[PDB]
């Protein structure tokens, strides 16, 4: 970790972005549906330059 530095951090707060969007929306139902979806999405290809989008040691 410390021994090998990184030029940039790969972990865009898109989920936080979606959450903020959901908060702004008056619709409660949409807010809840989007909250779980966005929360569940977490890591996505759109928010990462690499098209592979590989993540998670377990799978």
d(CA 44, CA 59): 15
Helices (H), 1-59: 14-24, 28-41
CA distances from 37 to 7, 8, 20, 27, 49 (A): 30, 27, 13, 15, 21
Per DSSP, 45 falls in state G
- Residue 19: half-sphere exposure toward Cβ, Cα within 13 Å: 9
d(CA 22, CA 36): 11
> Following CA atoms 25, 30, 36, 38 in sequence, which dihedral angle do they give, to the nearest 10 degrees?
-50
d(CA 50, CA 30): 30
d(CA 27, CA 23): 9
Residue 57: which region, alpha, beta or left (left: phi > 0; alpha: psi -120 to 50)? alpha
């Amino acid at each position: 970790g410390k021994s090998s530095p990184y030029q940039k951090k790969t972990e865009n707060p898109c989920a936080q972005r979606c959450l903020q969007s959901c908060q702004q929306e008056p619709d409660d139902l949409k807010q809840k549906a989007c909250e779980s979806r966005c929360t569940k999405l977490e890591y996505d290809p759109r928010c990462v330059y690499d098209p592979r989008g590989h993540t998670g040691t377990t799978n």
